Scaffold this active site. Sequence first.
Site, short mmCIF file in Angstrom:
data_model
loop_
_atom_site.label_atom_id
_atom_site.label_comp_id
_atom_site.label_asym_id
_atom_site.label_seq_id
_atom_site.Cartn_x
_atom_site.Cartn_y
_atom_site.Cartn_z
N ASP A 194 0.85 -1.18 0.00
CA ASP A 194 0.00 0.00 0.00
C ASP A 194 0.89 1.23 0.00
O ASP A 194 2.11 1.11 -0.08
CB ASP A 194 -0.95 -0.04 1.21
CG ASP A 194 -0.28 0.21 2.53
OD1 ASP A 194 0.96 0.38 2.61
OD2 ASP A 194 -1.03 0.24 3.54
N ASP A 196 1.20 4.82 2.34
CA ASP A 196 0.81 5.45 3.59
C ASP A 196 1.17 6.93 3.56
O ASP A 196 2.32 7.31 3.27
CB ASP A 196 1.54 4.75 4.74
CG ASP A 196 1.30 3.28 4.74
OD1 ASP A 196 0.13 2.90 4.93
OD2 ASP A 196 2.26 2.54 4.46
N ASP A 255 -3.53 4.48 2.57
CA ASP A 255 -3.97 4.91 3.89
C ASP A 255 -3.68 6.39 4.02
O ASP A 255 -2.54 6.81 3.87
CB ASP A 255 -3.25 4.12 4.97
CG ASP A 255 -3.69 2.66 5.02
OD1 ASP A 255 -4.85 2.37 4.73
OD2 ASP A 255 -2.91 1.77 5.35
N1 LIG Z 1 -0.70 3.54 15.20
C1 LIG Z 1 -1.06 2.76 14.15
N2 LIG Z 1 -0.08 2.30 13.34
C2 LIG Z 1 -0.38 1.51 12.27
C3 LIG Z 1 -1.78 1.14 12.00
N3 LIG Z 1 -1.77 0.36 10.90
C4 LIG Z 1 -0.47 0.24 10.50
N4 LIG Z 1 0.34 0.92 11.33
C5 LIG Z 1 1.81 1.05 11.26
O1 LIG Z 1 2.18 1.77 10.09
C6 LIG Z 1 3.43 1.28 9.62
C7 LIG Z 1 3.23 0.93 8.15
O2 LIG Z 1 2.32 -0.17 8.06
P1 LIG Z 1 2.17 -1.04 6.71
O3 LIG Z 1 1.73 -0.17 5.54
O4 LIG Z 1 1.33 -2.24 7.06
O5 LIG Z 1 3.66 -1.62 6.52
P2 LIG Z 1 4.84 -1.05 5.60
O6 LIG Z 1 6.08 -1.08 6.46
O7 LIG Z 1 4.41 0.25 4.95
O8 LIG Z 1 5.01 -2.23 4.52
P3 LIG Z 1 4.40 -2.20 3.04
O9 LIG Z 1 3.10 -1.44 3.15
O10 LIG Z 1 4.16 -3.62 2.66
O11 LIG Z 1 5.46 -1.43 2.29
C8 LIG Z 1 3.82 0.12 10.52
O12 LIG Z 1 4.75 0.53 11.54
C9 LIG Z 1 2.53 -0.29 11.18
O13 LIG Z 1 2.74 -0.87 12.47
C10 LIG Z 1 -2.79 1.68 12.94
O14 LIG Z 1 -4.00 1.41 12.77
N5 LIG Z 1 -2.37 2.46 13.96
MN LIG Z 2 2.59 0.54 3.85
MN LIG Z 3 -0.79 1.02 5.46
#
Ligand SMILES: Nc1nc2c(ncn2[C@@H]2O[C@H](COP(=O)(O)OP(=O)(O)OP(=O)(O)O)[C@@H](O)[C@H]2O)c(=O)[nH]1
Ligand SMILES: [Mn+2]
Ligand SMILES: [Mn+2]
Length: 331
Positions: A194, A196, A255
């Site tokens: 995704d 972020d 997100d």
């Molecule tokens: N506080 C909080 N943190 C979140 C939530 N959902 C995800 N995170 C954090 O946001 C960060 C990014 O999450 P992800 O998009 O799942 O993981 P990523 O490292 O971006 O990996 P890829 O998306 O696969 O590149 C991580 O540290 C998660 O723990 C939430 O609902 N609340």
């Molecule tokens: Mn991510």
């Molecule tokens: Mn995410």
Amino acid sequence: WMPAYACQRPTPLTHHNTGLSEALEILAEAAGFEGSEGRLLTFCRAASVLKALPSPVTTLSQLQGLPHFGEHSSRVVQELLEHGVCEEVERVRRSERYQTMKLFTQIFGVGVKTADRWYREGLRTLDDLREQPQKLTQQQKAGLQHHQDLSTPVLRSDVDALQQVVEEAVGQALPGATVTLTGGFRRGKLQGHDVDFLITHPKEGQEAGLLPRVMCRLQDQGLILYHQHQHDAFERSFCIFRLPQPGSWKAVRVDLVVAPVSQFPFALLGWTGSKLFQRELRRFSRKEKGLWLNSHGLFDPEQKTFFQAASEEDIFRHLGLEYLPPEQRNA
Ligand SMILES: Nc1nc2c(ncn2[C@@H]2O[C@H](COP(=O)(O)OP(=O)(O)OP(=O)(O)O)[C@@H](O)[C@H]2O)c(=O)[nH]1
Ligand SMILES: [Mn+2]
Ligand SMILES: [Mn+2]
């Protein structure tokens, strides 16, 4: 020698032990699917140690007192080194339970508890889920509709296009408001599941009502396939964007998170990850410093106080940790 917590050591994007860490992470994931949270964390920690090593592990000798490498993880690495394969790992990848749990949990809006329930009920395939729409949330329905595109790695080129349209919508809704790329892409990853983004405004309170405005603008451009707006937890929108491409388009998970500027550093730290890095940083804060860290703040539970941070660097300094830039948080 290497420190115990992942937040006390750099873990770069690329490393020398990808085969070994991938195998341990399969076992971690499988443990999570079975509700075995202790074992998940143990395998995750061992995998992260290998990512922090400067050289490939070619012989079992190279395990060296370094922490979080118990008997089980060591045995897995030994079998890989000796035989090129670990039977426990191969049994897991071939198992219907693991394959189905991976299939289901990868779908947008599906967690382990939902996936396990479905498995227990005899559901195995994506078609099986489409045959039982009454069992699906609207988010899960959208995840199914777009599952092929959402299983396709998101590329840096996709991120740059998405950041442009999000920045344009944010800028047009509220001059002054900022968009910051977070998640894996902030850590230097070339691909992801995704994208972020963290949105704020330098004046506290000017971020109120911004997200619905940004969403309206994006929707009117035909860029939104799905959105779920969630109003002390941050305001956020879980989205599927329709990203145009040359001759085509791709659905992409995005997100969008809004944080008031006072909480922004904590939000940026939490949302930048990696997931393991943040878990370790929180465990370190609690166990070693007596402070509770989350994405909103840093609380001293004895004094009943919150730490005022202007930056991630402030937070690291306050916790007695050497600063690690995001590209060294790939635990
Ligand atoms: N506080 C909080 N943190 C979140 C939530 N959902 C995800 N995170 C954090 O946001 C960060 C990014 O999450 P992800 O998009 O799942 O993981 P990523 O490292 O971006 O990996 P890829 O998306 O696969 O590149 C991580 O540290 C998660 O723990 C939430 O609902 N609340
Ligand atoms: Mn991510
Ligand atoms: Mn995410």
